[PDB]
Write a protein that binds this DNA or RNA. Structure first.
Length: 437
RNA sequence: UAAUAGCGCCGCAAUUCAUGCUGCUUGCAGCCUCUGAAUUUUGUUAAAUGAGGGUUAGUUUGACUGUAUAAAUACAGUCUUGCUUUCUGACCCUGGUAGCUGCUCACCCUGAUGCUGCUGUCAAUAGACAGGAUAGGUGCGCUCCCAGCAAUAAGGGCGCGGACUGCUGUAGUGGCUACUGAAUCACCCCCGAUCAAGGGGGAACCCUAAAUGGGUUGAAAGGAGAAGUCA
DNA sequence: TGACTTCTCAACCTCCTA
DNA sequence: TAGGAGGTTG
């Protein structure tokens, strides 16, 4: 599921409860994590479950295999304490305060009730979590947990500048992973269909093998309960999802001179429904691209000044690049949705170092026809000024936005030369031709 | 006095187009009013970017429902919370105190993606005082260029000693800590809190005759963690 | 440090209390 | 009976 997103909030409590949480994780959770890593490093992740069992009594029950899960995710990769992750929809118990605010109660923490402070841009997610747990309570465990919209959540701490307290300096922050497709009723229908298919495949797969008489039967009972309870749905909002036209394709061409141009084109016919350039996608936020290019130049020069020896280079850095890469993705997906586009086509990232080099060569030859010295000089100056875009965050951001809205994404091969609009159109047509296979 | 020239950007123009408008013949014809695209040609008495370091639980971008709704949107109602970000404003500063620490210099030459560059007064010393972000140059910036430095790029020349070193003063230039000075804001003012909490008062614009009558008094985007690799 | 890459995204079934 | 906390497992 690439549609899942992450919401965040800040948790608030008395100094006493905050002290208990700080002590509990900093003195127990992160030492246990460090110990378990030190153990796995010298080991000659299933065995980790019984590896941690002896460590249980050495120094909060759910937090012990929370640390196991953290360790497993660390291993599979190949004064703030580490984040405490609850990888369960039901680890958190939501409630409404007497003053109306939401509160979280964690399973391992009986008396630790934290009031939730969030932004109105994402309060509806917390209200949805509350309504979901209330619906399960009303149905008396008659709804499958795969549709409570709260996949998992980890609690972290954050740093301050008061410099005068053990924990009052650090702010709590809850990060809940929420499945965006799980909001609307029809998206939940699709999620239920996929999860039922996965359950069928997994039950068929393990039935071909033999397991313990009690644990395997417990798993089977759990899966049958899930399949039974998954058909009973929730009273969620209804949205018609998205239709999508197969023959309409929105191709996006990435380059150096123009970071992103877009062509909405028919495939059954050959007419381009509409082009849009970078200035037309950013709109009123176009000065952001130019000031970001200037900032990128400044930062690159500063890094090359201090590659020998200086302090960290984050001086003057920001997330303007991410903001632009999100504005661009929003605009592109909106443009696709306007024309009922059925798919957004993007260049393969690997063929991105080649494309920018070819574009620089093309620009140099366009400026200086055959003067090789001038072409090299202009290429150097252009690389100095028009720095390489961050074509990785853009592709990922477009993927996230398209998956959220429902527009499928295909990958094509960007043509080497031609005008950016022509490159975009031919990219889209090439993608459609490959899809014909 | 100097910034010639070059590159990127920003607009102003012209031509050509359509991703534009018209017209139905719905893919054609014309046109450039809008919206843009592509060049080249310019930087005004004009336009748009761009403007050193900081300051808000800042405002807006929100959810559901019912519609008119294909949908946009708009309306109505209810609810709304304060997270992480990017702009635009407005405001404050151009720091002090102590310490601790890194770098670089016998002296010359060439001169780096090297450093410095605001105004005014006092001096015309090298520094204070007052202001202050319009801050060396071009409309704006740049590794470009200009003036000075340049030991703190690189390379070369090159004296006295010890056997790679010294010719070195806080001298220049950086970093770290602790305390500390101002703004602690989003129409303005006052009080009040910061693991919470808002309240009061005032001004102006539209509706409204007028009414504590209502509003308005800038907007945007979010998928987060962890690990590894490359540069 | 930037850039890239990988991965992460339960859940009903038990027992226990108030 | 309805929460609160533990279990397990490919």
């Amino acid at each position: 599921n690439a549609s899942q997103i992450t919401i965040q909030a800040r948790l608030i409590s008395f100094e006493s409860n905050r002290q208990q949480l700080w002590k509990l994780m900093a003195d127990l959770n992160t030492p246990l994590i460090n110990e378990l890593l030190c153990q796995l490093g010298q080991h000659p992740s299933t065995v980790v479950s019984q590896l941690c069992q002896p460590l249980k009594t050495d120094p909060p029950s759910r937090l012990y295999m929370s640390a196991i899960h953290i360790v497993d995710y660390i291993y599979k990769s190949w004064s703030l304490p580490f984040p405490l992750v609850f990888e369960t929809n039901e680890d958190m118990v939501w409630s409404k305060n007497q003053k109306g605010r939401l509160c979280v109660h964690f399973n391992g923490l009986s008396d630790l009730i934290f009031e939730v402070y969030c932004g109105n841009r994402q309060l509806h997610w917390f209200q949805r979590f509350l309504e979901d747990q209330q619906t399960k309570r009303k149905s008396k465990n008659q709804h499958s947990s795969g549709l409570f919209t709260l996949r998992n959540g980890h609690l972290v701490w954050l740093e301050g500048e008061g410099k005068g307290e053990p924990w009052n300096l650090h702010h709590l922050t809850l990060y809940c992973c929420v499945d965006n497709r799980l909001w609307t009723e029809e998206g939940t229908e699709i999620v239920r269909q996929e999860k039922a298919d996965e359950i069928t495949k997994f039950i068929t797969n393990m039935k071909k093998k033999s397991d313990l008489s009690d644990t395997q039967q417990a798993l089977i009972q759990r899966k049958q309960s899930t399949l039974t309870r998954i058909n009973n749905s929730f009273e969620r909002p209804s949205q018609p999802l998205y239709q999508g036209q197969s023959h309409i394709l929105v191709g996006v061409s990435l380059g150096l001179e123009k970071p992103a141009t877009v062509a909405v084109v028919d495939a059954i016919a050959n007419k381009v429904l509409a082009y849009r350039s970078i200035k037309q996608l950013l709109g009123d936020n176009y000065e952001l691209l130019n000031r970001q290019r200037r900032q990128q130049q400044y930062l690159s020069h500063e890094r090359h000044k201090a590659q020998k020896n200086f302090s960290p280079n984050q001086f003057g850095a920001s997330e303007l690049g991410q903001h632009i890469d999100r504005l661009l993705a929003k605009a592109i997906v909106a443009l696709a949705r306007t024309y009922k586009a059925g798919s957004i086509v993007l260049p393969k990232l690997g063929d991105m170092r080649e494309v920018v080099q070819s574009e620089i060569q093309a620009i140099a030859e366009q400026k200086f026809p055959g003067y090789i010295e001038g072409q090299q000089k202009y290429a150097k100056q252009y690389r100095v000024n028009v720095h390489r875009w961050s074509y990785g965050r853009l592709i990922q951001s477009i993927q996230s936005k398209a998956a959220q809205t429902g527009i499928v994404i295909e990958e094509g091969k960007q043509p080497i030369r031609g005008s950016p609009h022509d490159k975009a159109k031919e990219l889209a047509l090439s993608a459609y031709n490959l899809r014909l296979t």
